[PDB]
Design a protein around this ligand. Structure first.
Ligand SMILES: Nc1ncnc2c1ncn2[C@@H]1O[C@H](COP(=O)(O)OP(=O)(O)OP(=O)(O)O)[C@@H](O)[C@H]1O
Ligand SMILES: Nc1ncnc2c1ncn2[C@@H]1O[C@H](COP(=O)(O)OP(=O)(O)O)[C@@H](O)[C@H]1O
Ligand SMILES: [Mg+2]
Ligand SMILES: [Mg+2]
Lengths: 296, 229
């Protein structure tokens, strides 16, 4: 047994060391198991909410004061806007004005410490966030894709028809391309979209948003990656096919915002004389006049 | 006379269809040229191909290779200092350094950084808007000091303020350099009277080239460019 010990004692020590390492790793994972409160449940009844709830889509914001975290200064404050069904209204401006922030103000992506937003009938402070974003839509500035197929890229579920898939492809000017593809919207998008171009991927994202029959949603300067010809054709087709729908448009191209019902200009942390396009361009006093004149 | 192709054929995979077919290229030295077209038309692919990347089925590609400056169609970055990835292993030049930065007009965004210039950024460093990402990518080729400079969609992220300021300051500085040939592409056509040479392509095939006289022969393409005016 002395031989036994002389043999196995050193293994005992070495295994103590190695398991110390492994348990330190386990403790690391566990210290990560501590997670912050996301607050999915909103203090509102789902029974009080009808199924096709966001019917009209009238939106009235007031004194909406947001900030990403509590430590950071408020990024958008003292803003008010009653938005009717208003088939297409526009928001634009220079960078950093908080337009993407305000886009994320709907989905409660931001801490919104002061103020509130009313979707028709109700605030934002009480919905279940899952229910919240389930019944709306958005087109991110950047295109982000999914390793899989067009079926899976558009439909995480399967609760859709290929007819509507081809429809969304067409109204986004993709079906024409896809016809040339041998997959039959069954090819493989590899690693976030390394097969297609920047604008191609942005188009895919647009269409994916377009899969939803939602009549109210928003876009974050989606056309920035898109060239002029497809820009015109796409904005026309989406305005027509969404003649009923209420879309809020961020535009890194004011030439696209010249068509919306209302134009919303953000300078630093609020709107400066949101109005119809014709009035703002003929008054010249708004800085959007300079925005459209520098382009011409 | 510089980098050019005679009847270029190019493809991503040799088993599939040839990406580029019968493309003929020419860029004069010390000239600012642009390449425009449709989305997915094949504009970045021709460029990557000119960078030895794409499997050419056929064609001859004559050069002067050189340490061609480059900014990808999407911004990329290293996991190192703002100054680090901007320098990209070059002899640090305060003059050239701040000149490039004020060209990209990144100084306000550098002030807002916790460590300003010596801020470690990246997948390990701190995240930031793709606008700064794009401006830094452009600065990579700007401060690169390379003879043949190259850009891919440096304007997508930026708004018109920063686009104008960048192109004016930086591109006018490039054309202000003696023979620092710089090639790019764009999604807006307003600076097309500011381009020297032009390449037009659609669906993976060149269409036209030539600044003023070669354009005016097209009523269709030039009315298309005139749709925005
Ligand atoms: N990494 C890749 N591998 C295989 N095929 C690609 C790859 N990138 C692009 N393609 C295909 O080659 C064609 C040409 O794309 P290209 O690289 O020219 O993009 P682009 O048109 O310059 O970008 P944009 O559409 O933003 O102008 C596209 O139709 C695309 O489907
Ligand atoms: N994730 C973030 N964390 C902290 N601040 C942010 C974040 N995203 C944006 N901001 C701040 O919000 C302002 C505007 O943001 P955003 O709306 O995304 O850009 P833009 O106004 O150009 O669309 C910027 O000044 C930026 O500093
Ligand atoms: Mg934004
Ligand atoms: Mg490209």
């Amino acid at each position: 047994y002395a031989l036994m010990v002389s043999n196995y004692l050193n293994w005992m020590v070495r295994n103590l060391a190695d398991m110390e390492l492994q348990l330190g790793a386990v403790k690391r994972i566990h210290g990560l198991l501590k997670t912050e409160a996301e607050s999915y449940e909103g203090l509102l009844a789902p029974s009080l909410i009808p199924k096709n709830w966001p019917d009209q889509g009238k939106i009235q914001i007031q004194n909406l004061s947001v900030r990403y975290d509590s430590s950071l200064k408020p990024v958008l404050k003292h803003v008010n806007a009653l938005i009717a069904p208003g088939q297409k209204i526009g928001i634009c401006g220079r960078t950093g004005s908080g337009k993407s922030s305000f886009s994320l103000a709907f989905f409660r992506m931001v801490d919104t410490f002061e103020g509130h937003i009313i979707i028709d009938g109700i605030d934002i402070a009480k919905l279940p966030l899952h229910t919240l974003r389930s019944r709306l839509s958005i087109i991110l500035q950047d295109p982000v894709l999914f390793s899989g197929t067009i079926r899976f890229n558009l439909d995480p579920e399967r609760k859709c028809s290929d007819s509507t898939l081809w429809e969304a492809l067409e109204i986004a000017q993709l079906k024409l391309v896809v016809k040339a593809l041998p997959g039959g919207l069954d090819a493989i998008i590899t690693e976030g979209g390394e097969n297609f171009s920047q604008g191609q991927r942005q188009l895919f994202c647009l269409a994916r948003a377009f899969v939803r029959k939602t009549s109210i949603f928003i876009m974050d300067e989606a056309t920035a990656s898109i060239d002029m010809a497809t820009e015109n054709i796409l904005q026309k087709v989406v305005m027509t096919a969404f003649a009923d729908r209420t879309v809020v448009t961020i535009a890194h191209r004011v030439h696209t915002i010249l068509s919306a019902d209302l134009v919303i200009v953000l300078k630093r942390g609020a709107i400066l004389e949101f109005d119809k396009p014709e009035k703002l361009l003929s008054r010249k006093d708004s800085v959007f006049a300079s925005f459209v004149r520098a382009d011409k | 006379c510089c980098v050019q192709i005679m009847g270029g054929y190019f493809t991503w995979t040799p088993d599939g269809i040839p990406t580029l077919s019968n493309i003929t290229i020419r860029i004069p030295r010390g000239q600012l040229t642009m390449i425009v077209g449709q989305v997915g038309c094949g504009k970045s692919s021709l460029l990557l191909a000119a960078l030895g990347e794409m499997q050419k089925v056929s064609g001859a590609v004559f050069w002067s290779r050189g340490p061609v400056a480059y900014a990808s169609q999407k911004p990329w970055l290293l996991n190192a200092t703002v100054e680090e990835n901007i320098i990209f292993e070059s002899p640090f030049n305060k003059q050239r350094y701040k000149m490039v930065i004020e060209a990209c007009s990144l100084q306000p965004d550098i002030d807002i950084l916790p460590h300003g210039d010596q801020t470690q950024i990246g997948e390990r460093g701190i995240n930031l808007s793709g606008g700064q990402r794009q401006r830094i990518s452009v600065a990579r080729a700007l401060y690169q000091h390379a003879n043949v400079v190259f850009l891919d969609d440096p304007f997508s992220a930026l708004d018109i303020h920063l686009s104008d300021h960048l192109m004016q300051a930086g591109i006018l500085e490039l054309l202000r350099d003696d023979k620092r040939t710089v090639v790019l592409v764009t999604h807006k056509l307003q600076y097309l009277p500011h381009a020297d040479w032009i390449i037009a392509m659609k669906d993976g095939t060149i269409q036209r080239e030539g600044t003023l006289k070669d354009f005016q022969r097209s009523e269709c393409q030039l009315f298309e460019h005139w749709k925005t005016l």
